[PDB]
Amino acid sequence: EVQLVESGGGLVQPGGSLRLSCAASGFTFSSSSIHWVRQAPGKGLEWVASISSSSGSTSYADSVKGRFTISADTSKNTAYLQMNSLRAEDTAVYYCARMSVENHWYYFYWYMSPYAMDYWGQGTLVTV
Amino acid sequence: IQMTQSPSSLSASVGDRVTITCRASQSVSSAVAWYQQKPGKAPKLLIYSASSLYSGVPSRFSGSRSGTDFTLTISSLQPEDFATYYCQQSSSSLITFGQGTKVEI
Amino acid sequence: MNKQIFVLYFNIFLIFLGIGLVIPVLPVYLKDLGLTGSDLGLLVAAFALSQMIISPFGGTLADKLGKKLIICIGLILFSVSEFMFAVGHNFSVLMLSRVIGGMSAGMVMPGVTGLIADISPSHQKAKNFGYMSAIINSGFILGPGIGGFMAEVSHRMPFYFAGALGILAFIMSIVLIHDPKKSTTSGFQKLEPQLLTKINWKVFITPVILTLVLSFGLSAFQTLYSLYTADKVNYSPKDISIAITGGGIFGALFQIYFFDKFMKYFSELTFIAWSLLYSVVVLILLVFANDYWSIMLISFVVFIGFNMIRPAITNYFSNIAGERQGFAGGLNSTFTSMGNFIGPLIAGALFDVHIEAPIYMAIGVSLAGVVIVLIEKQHRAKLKEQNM
């Protein structure tokens, strides 16, 4: 079994900046993509960010596009997400999850494994 | 991509069949997954691909695909099953989650 | 564009250049070893047959046992096969070297496709397939030209050059590419049969037959042209190289300009039918050529006819399937290999019966393709008028 450890969060003045970290443990980082999601207090989930280490592609949700940033250091297998602007709506519990991204060869063609968040690290909390 | 899950809330007793519907305004192929979230715990995956079956989930949780409709079925409702379910779309780069369905006992 | 992608494309370009090296040298091997048409039909089709046979197992090995190692082994085998083709002086040795070269091709190509699928982002599943066809066609065209231009010095220079290029590619692969060492602790048990169980085969019949006809015609044309011109007009290999290279260059430069403009006026199916009609009209004229420059320019006006067909079939595959870029690419590659087999074998077997018989066979195949397109016209009309 594997598990991702998540660190960060706390009291934040609106419009400030913060760095949240998700450190991997025991699973492949190159063959996986790290995804950050949020949960508002008493509300539903919504996927926030996405990064793939091998391909290098990054993507962000349309609700929050281009404001925050994401990065992944393969040297020690960690993922960083940076908030540059905060508001009262942004308060939530953030989770870090992984989806495998690797091809498998059926005879005469490759196919991609499906998108499914296997392991979820314990979420941190951010206020204001 | 807009995604709608029904019903918003649903009350059922022990051992009763529970059916949850999830519909997308646009085609998403069969990349719809189903998650279960406990109160105050990290969401745990239930079904990865449409009509598939993850490892460790009891067989009583099943998925079905019919055009736009994605249906989650539970034959028996053990009291341990009280949680909030979600349908997730991951066909494209953007990812969307359903509203949720907190089940009453 | 990093060095990884350049090396990955070079690994495909060299391998698909290795197919066309034999053809321009046939003005010698037909008389030096006393071989007939069927001998060449087997000798050239051996590469395609071996590649088609070994592609499944090569891909399986690349998946299970890593990708860099499989690519490196394939490059080593390709270099060894080219060198053994060069050194040998018997039909059996050349046959075995062609088989080994086909094995190396069919064990490298899946590895490179998988490595590109790994490196390339998820949203570029269509553009990468376009690069696949572009590089494959460029190699298939520039094969005979380089082969003949090197055959002028000696009978064995082109294959030494191919082996040296293979060694250089292997060195670059060792020094440059890299794949991860770790693996997933627990995967999924799906084994992916779902796509094969969710396919309408009737909607895929027309593109398959179209691409098979295109591949058969294009592969058989070179084999037929070399022998026909070496007999009737007794070209030197230099002339064959000039003809093939000029025709390919003209076709490429006209395709990169006029295809989209033609598409804004014509549908893909009707344009494919018109291109087949133009090709068969030109092949009818090919029979009556009795001089130098007429049969020289015949190839120039022929290659455009198929360079206006190949991208059309590629776009047809991309559009008619949907989100399944991988399956469309797999079908296109498999049937291109099957065509590259079925072409030269027939074009060599029919050469012994008569000098012009394979021209008739190519004409008949083009007519079959165009009438198949015309038959599908009724189906598309029925689909169109039943919904609006």
Residue numbers in the entry:
A (entry chain C): 27 to 154
B (entry chain D): 26 to 130
C (entry chain A): 1 to 388
Give sentences from the paper.
Efflux pump antiporters confer drug resistance to bacteria by coupling proton import with the expulsion of antibiotics from the cytoplasm. Here, we uncover the proton-coupling mechanism of the Staphylococcus aureus efflux pump NorA by elucidating structures in various protonation states of two essential acidic residues using cryo-EM. NorA contains two essential membrane embedded acidic residues at positions Glu222 and Asp307 which are conserved across S. aureus strains and required for conferring fluoroquinolone resistance to the human pathogen methicillin-resistant S. aureus (MRSA). Hence, the two acidic residues serve as a “belt and suspenders” protection mechanism to prevent simultaneous binding of protons and drug that enforce NorA coupling stoichiometry and confer antibiotic resistance.
We deduced residues Glu222 and Asp307 of NorA were predominantly protonated at pH 5.0 by showing that a double mutant mimicking the protonated state (NorAE222Q,D307N) was unable to bind Fab36 at pH values of 5.0 or 7.5. Hence, to elucidate the structure of this conformation by cryo-EM, we identified a new Fab (FabDA1) using phage display against NorAE222Q,D307N to ensure binders to the protonated state. Both wild-type NorA and the double mutant bound FabDA1 with a low micromolar affinity at pH 5.0 but only NorAE222Q,D307N bound at pH 7.5, consistent with FabDA1 being a conformation selective binder. NorA-FabDA1 and NorAE222Q,D307N-FabDA1 were purified as 1:1 complexes at pH 5.0 and 7.5, respectively, and used for collection of large cryo-EM datasets. Subsequent processing yielded cryo-EM maps at 3.26 Å resolution for NorA and 3.61 Å resolution for NorAE222Q,D307N, which contained the CDRH3 loop or the variable portion of FabDA1 following local refinement. Structures of NorA and NorAE222Q,D307N each displayed the inward-occluded conformation (backbone Cα r.m.s.d of 0.82 Å), where the substrate binding pockets were partially occluded from the cytoplasmic side of the membrane and fully closed from the periplasmic side. Similar tethering interactions and hydrophobic environment were observed in the NorAE222Q,D307N-FabDA1 complex, albeit with contacts mediated by the mutated residues, Gln222 and Asn307. The similarity of interactions with TM5 and overall structural correspondence between wild-type NorA and double mutant structures supported the conclusion that Glu222 and Asp307 were in the protonated forms in the wild-type NorA structure and that the E222Q and D307N mutations suitably mimicked the protonated forms.
